[PDB]
Structure formats: structure tokens, C-alpha cells
Amino acid sequence: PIVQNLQGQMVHQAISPRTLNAWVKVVEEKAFSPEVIPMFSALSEGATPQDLNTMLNTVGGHQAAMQMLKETINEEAAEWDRLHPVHAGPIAPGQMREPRGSDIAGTTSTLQEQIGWMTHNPPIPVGEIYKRWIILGLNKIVRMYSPTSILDIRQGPKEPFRDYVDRFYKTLRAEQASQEVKNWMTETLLVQNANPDCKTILKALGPGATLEEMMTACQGV
Amino acid sequence: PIVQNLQGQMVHQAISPRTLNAWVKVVEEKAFSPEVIPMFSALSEGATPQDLNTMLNTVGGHQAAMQMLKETINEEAAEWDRLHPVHAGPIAPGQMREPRGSDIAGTTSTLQEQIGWMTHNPPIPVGEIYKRWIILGLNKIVRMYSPTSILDIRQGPKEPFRDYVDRFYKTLRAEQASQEVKNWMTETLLVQNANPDCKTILKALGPGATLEEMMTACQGV
Amino acid sequence: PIVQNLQGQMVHQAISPRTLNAWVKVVEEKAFSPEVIPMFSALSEGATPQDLNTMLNTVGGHQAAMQMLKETINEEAAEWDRLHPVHAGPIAPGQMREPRGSDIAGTTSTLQEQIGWMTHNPPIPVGEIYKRWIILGLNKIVRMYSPTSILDIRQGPKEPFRDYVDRFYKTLRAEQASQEVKNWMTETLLVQNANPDCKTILKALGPGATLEEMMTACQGV
Amino acid sequence: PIVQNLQGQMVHQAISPRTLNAWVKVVEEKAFSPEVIPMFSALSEGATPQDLNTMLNTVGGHQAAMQMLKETINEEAAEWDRLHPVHAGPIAPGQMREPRGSDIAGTTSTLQEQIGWMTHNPPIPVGEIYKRWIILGLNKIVRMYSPTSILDIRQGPKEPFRDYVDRFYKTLRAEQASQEVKNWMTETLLVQNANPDCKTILKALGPGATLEEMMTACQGV
Numbered sequence A, B, C, D: 001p002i003v004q005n006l007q008g009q010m011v012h013q014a015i016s017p018r019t020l021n022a023w024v025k026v027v028e029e030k031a032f033s034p035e036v037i038p039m040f041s042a043l044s045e046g047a048t049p050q051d052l053n054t055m056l057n058t059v060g061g062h063q064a065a066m067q068m069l070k071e072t073i074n075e076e077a078a079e080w081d082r083l084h085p086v087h088a089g090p091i092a093p094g095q096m097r098e099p100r101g102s103d104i105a106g107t108t109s110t111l112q113e114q115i116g117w118m119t120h121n122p123p124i125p126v127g128e129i130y131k132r133w134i135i136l137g138l139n140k141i142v143r144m145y146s147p148t149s150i151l152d153i154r155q156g157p158k159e160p161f162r163d164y165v166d167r168f169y170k171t172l173r174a175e176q177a178s179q180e181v182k183n184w185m186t187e188t189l190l191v192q193n194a195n196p197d198c199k200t201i202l203k204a205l206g207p208g209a210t211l212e213e214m215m216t217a218c219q220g221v
């Protein structure tokens, strides 16, 4: 985080040990359930790339996943570097050097330049692009850790409908696809994969039946 | 939350990670018992739709209930959009764009727009209507998740009257009904289901007995 | 159709009997399989709306199909009327009047009027618009008359991959969801539903593989 | 096509509806078996590129086939542009301009232009060149849609030699390797894959035997 001192100049503030330990416990306990992404984005609000690096390195276990995240961050940094070629020439006192692909990731940047980049007007959000790369990696990790694809979620012969819907929507949350495909999956795959006992009821209800109506109608079975 | 900086400009503040973890734990332990709604409205005091979306997304299990909440929010947003038609024309410097139905939910807006909305005079409380929609959805979820119907709560042969009346009133709170049906239930169904030893005293007491009078009348057994 | 007589003046020419015979064979024997649309769009080459109605009377035998077609025509005519409000005022005597939603449909127009409309500089196409509305109706009918859903197209244990791909693409063309859902279906659902051996080869091939490579690699299995 | 009117001036004549109907039947029912090419080359007799595009829109139903066809057209157009650099300078007013790679394809040309191009002394054929590019695309598609490789065409225990030869030559015409490999296939692979009795007779006949003698000697076996 970045805060203003008494004089009003921006000063970095280290993350409290409570937040850091909460994030570490979330990563080590939850495996990589899909709710880690919102929790991470809530715990890392307006943080400098050094803070993100601390929040990532501090994790003790799940080292394979952190390695995959390292690979994804490196690929995104290389692509960004290719997109922005270096402008040769001395930097005027009124500006600062343009951050390269690895300057964003914090492997070759000091704290002061990172503070200066996004506190400048107009701002260049190093933190908000680094967090985008990290979240893009976490999406792949979460998708990998989820057991089964959405197309293989099937209600058992005896399973209650509420548990089946819970499994289906957990898997769909873990799924990686655009929003339109997710809407189609919600509309059709839910009815299509049900057990024979509830499939007839769901078809008889109609094509525009809301989730509440389906679950209250299939409550007994 | 909304806080002022040193200069006096409104600045968004992230929710405390302790509060967020407390809400997640509340949803973990309490399932969807009726006391969740006051807890939510206490933990989400004066929060922008960004914070509400964070607090809703962070929940890990019970994904079917969160999907019902999503559908209810969508219905309320569509009804709001129909109720307030779109106005065509350029935006004056002294005003801001009129929010649409999907604008209140925070899924198609920035945080700065909402900050300006809920601080500009006259206020347009996006947060205070999003919280209304969320509570409206949570009410249906709580009613549906009630483990047993009111008619099935009956005092046991050896159960003291305190336990039976507590179970009955908790179930009555969960199964939300109108006021007059609640009055009839309290007056008649409470007496009807009791064990014979308590039923005799309740009947002999009279029809217009308050809850305290019944509880202190049947205290001996 | 429209032809030029010996005096250089455009004159309507009726649809030859065997073209109507071919369209009647298409309607009565193809059972509204997804190939009715190309054959209609071929047989109706540059036809004035009177000829379009002459070809449409064949569908009048099927009550449900003709009802769907009439409803779609009327809805598109209403939308056309809404989007083109009739201008009240003097018009240049060298120009023709304006086609109403019931005059582009040939219900209340005469043949000379449509001939003048089509043979104009610049031309105002009425036949093409009417044909687009008819094709919308036929798309709806073909979607209704589909024999199986896209999620039920599964390759047999020993069916060649080419037959399965042709069946899948025919069903996907009948169902006609949006474009993005179609791309997702082609990329993922095609691989998912295949028989074990072809599924193994397609999985081992990799993700995001063009159809040519899939069919070439899975040729003799 | 191109016809001469009553004044002796070449005028374009549209493709009759039933020719387009026949081509649509060819596309939709033959499943791109190796006989689509002769029927296309027959139905497209002397057609200006506008008519070629009109016939090509039928293939637009098949996404993959149309993509392959479009790619081949574009590649050949690029090669044509490269091999015929546009000459900048004055031209004789009695001569027409030069057809670009996107003007021989009828995408950016008008009908009168192509009529003038084709009806020239000496003629500059645009229809024939466009048809050659289309046939290249169709060859690629037919090769993709083949049901079995040439090495898997084996005569059955009791299949007559004539049926086996016809199947073999159809598959060899689909696969369309170079000419020398085709001659080697015909000479050797045909004898190699035959059933034991016909293989014995063909071996005993000798090497370098014409097809007529092979089929005459192996008639009733």
C-alpha cells in the first residue's frame, strides 16, 4: 500500500502480519478452490509489486503451483516487453524511466521507483498490471486443480438435487470460458445432466424455469 | 466504506480482512439460519457495491444459494431498468451518467463512479439499494433452507416446555409468513402440538395468554 | 423474375412450372432437414414477392410450419414499419411511392409496382428483404423439427470420424446458437463426445487444433 | 454466363435457378466425395466471377470447407498480384484497365467490367482462372474429407476385382499425390493389396501389365 506522510508525500506502508498470515492460511488450507481469486484480490488492494512478491513468496507449500505461476508471470512479462520496445535516450528530470517487462514483476525494481510510477500524474499502474498477470496465472492453476470438467458433472441415482446443483456450480465457477458460453452451460447442461428421476420434472417445467423453481420442484426427490 | 483524506476528498477504503473472514466464517458455520441477514447488514455498513460483490464472491461453499442470489439480483436489476428508462443526451460537467440496472450491481462500472454517486449531493445511494436487493434474495434463500416445516415441530414426551417453545419460535422465524397467519400459529398451533401434560394447562389458562404467561404457567413440568 | 423485353422495358416473367415442382419436392420429401434453406435460397433466385408468395403457398399444407412462417413475417413487417415511418408530403412525379410493410410482402401490391421497385436506379430490393424474412421463418421451423440435441451427438464405437463430424456439423447448423457458442462447441464438445480411441488421439494432439489436422490425424481409426 | 442480345452487344445473363439448385444438391448430398469436382466444373460452364461467387455462397454453410476455400483463393490471389505487378502509366482509351487479384475474384469489380474482360479480342479469361482457384480449394477439401487412406484399400475374400479396382481408383483420385507416385501405386500397390486368388493370377501374369489385361484375365475370379 501507499500512504501520505505528514508532509503529504507518498510513503509505502508494509502489509500487516495479520493480512499476510490470513492469505498464507487461505492458500495452504483451501487447496486452490475457486474462491482464492476474490480473496486474493480483496487482500491485495492497491499494493506495490514488492508487496505482491511478498504475498506470493511467503507461501510455504504448494510449490508446483507457485512454479506454474512463475512461468505465467514470466510469459506475460515477456509479451509486455515485446509490445513496448525500449526508447533510447536520457530521462529528463520531469519524468522517469519506462518500466520494462521485468520491472513490473519487481525482480529488477526498487521500492522508490515503484512508488513513483503509480503516484505520478498521469499514473502508470505497475501494481494493477502485475496483479492482472498474477490473477491470469491463478486462473490456470485453479482450473488445473478442479477435479472434473463441467461436461462430466452428473447427478447420481440417489443424490439430492441441491447437492448436485452445488457441485455443478462449483465446477462451473472453476471453469475457464467466456461469459456467453457460461450462460449457455447454465441454461442447458444443468437440465441435461440430471438423473432420470428429476430430468422429467425439469423438462416438464419449461425452458425458462428459474433455478429457484427447479430446486423447489425437485425438493422431494 | 467511505472515508475522507487529509485534503478532504472522499477515498475508498478496503474492508478489513478480519471482517471479511468473520463473514465467511459466519456463512460457514450458520448455514443459512435466519440470523445471517442481521449479521450481513451489520458487517456491510456503508459499503459500495464493490465491497458487497467482494463479500458475496468470497463465500466458498453453498454455491447454489449464491446462484439464487445472482438470479434475484438480475431480476431486481431488470425491473429497475424497466422502471427508469434510459435518457439520451450528453452529460453536463456538473452531473454524471444515470446508472442502469446492471450499473447498480457493480458488474459494469468502476469504483470511482460509485464513489462519486454515493458522495455527490443529492446522494444516489447505489450501495444502499444493492444491499436491499441482496437482503431480498437472502430472505428467499433463508426461507427455502429451513430444515423442517412448522407443522412438524411437536413437543416430545419428556421435553421441557422451554426447549419446545424455543424450537417452535426459531422455526416460525425461519418459515416467514404474514402477520395474521403468524398470530394464528402462535395462538393455536403452539397449544395443539404440546404434550398432554402441558396441553392441559395451556388449554385451561385461556385463549388470550401471552408467551410469558404460558412459559411461567408450565414451568413446573 | 425480371427480364427485358424486345422494347427494352422490364417485364415480369412467371416462375416456370418445374421450379415450383422442385420446391414442392424439397418441402414434401426433405422433412425440413437443415438443407431446405440453401435449396430455397437457390430456387428463389431474384424473385418478385408475388413469386415468393407463389412458392410459399406450398408450405400452407403444413399448418404449424405455415403458422410459424406467418408469425415471423408479420413481426418483421411490424419492425420494418416502425423503423421506416411513412413520410407525408409531396413526392417527385418521377419517383414511385414507398413500400409499406404489407407492400414489400406482396399482399397489397401489384406486379407492376414491384417490377418498378426492383428495376430502379439505384435499386430498392424488395425480393431480397422478403427472402430474408422467409429464411428467418425457415430457420425457426428447421430448429423446431430437429431430431436430436447437440449434446446427444456421440460417435459410435466403430463409426468413422468423418461420418461423426458430418453428423455433428449438420446438427450444429440446425440448432444455430450464437457464434461464440458455436465456436466453443466445435472446439471442445466435438472432442468430448468422441469414441475412446479417437478421443485419445484428439486429446494427445493438443488444444486449439484446426479441423483439417484432426481429421487427417484420425483418418483410419 | 455471357450472351449476345438483339443488338449484337454482349450482356450478362444470370444463372438459372435450377442450376444453383443442382449445385446445392451436389454440395449437401455428395459429402465431398471425389466426384464433386467434375460436377462443379460442369455446372460452372463459362460463368463470370459474380456467378462463381453466387455458386460459392452455398459452401458457406460448412464453416471449415469455406475457410479452406477462402484461404486458397487468397493465397492464389497474392501469387497473382506478385507475378503481375501493376503498371503505372497511360493506357489506350480503347482498352480496359487491369484486373487486380481482388478484381479477378469479383469482390471489387462490377458486372460490366467482367463482361468486357471476357468478351475481348483476344479474350482475357477471368472466369477460367477463378474456376481454377476454386478447383484447387475443392481438391484440398476433398483430400481432407477422404474416408480411408490408399494403403487401407484391400480387396475382400470374395469381392469381384472390378469393384476393388473402382474403389482403389476413387481413393487414389481423392488422395492426389504426385504423378510418379500415382503410377507406382497403380502398378504395384494394386497388385500387392489384392485377395490371394487374384493376387496369384496377377503375379503369374507378369510385371508391367496394363489394366485392361489385368481385368480381362481376372474377370470371373
Ligand SMILES: O=P(O)(O)O[C@H]1[C@H](OP(=O)(O)O)[C@@H](OP(=O)(O)O)[C@H](OP(=O)(O)O)[C@@H](OP(=O)(O)O)[C@H]1OP(=O)(O)O
Binding pocket: C018, C019, C021, C022, C025, D018, D019, D021, D022, D025
Ligand atoms: O440428368 P437429367 O435427366 O436432366 O435429370 C434431371 C435432374 O433429376 P435427377 O438428378 O434427380 O435425375 C433434375 O434434378 P436437379 O438436381 O436439377 O434438382 C430434375 O429437376 P428437379 O429438381 O425439378 O427434380 C429433372 O427433372 P424434371 O424433368 O422434373 O425437370 C431431371 O430431368 P429429367 O426428368 O428429364 O430426367
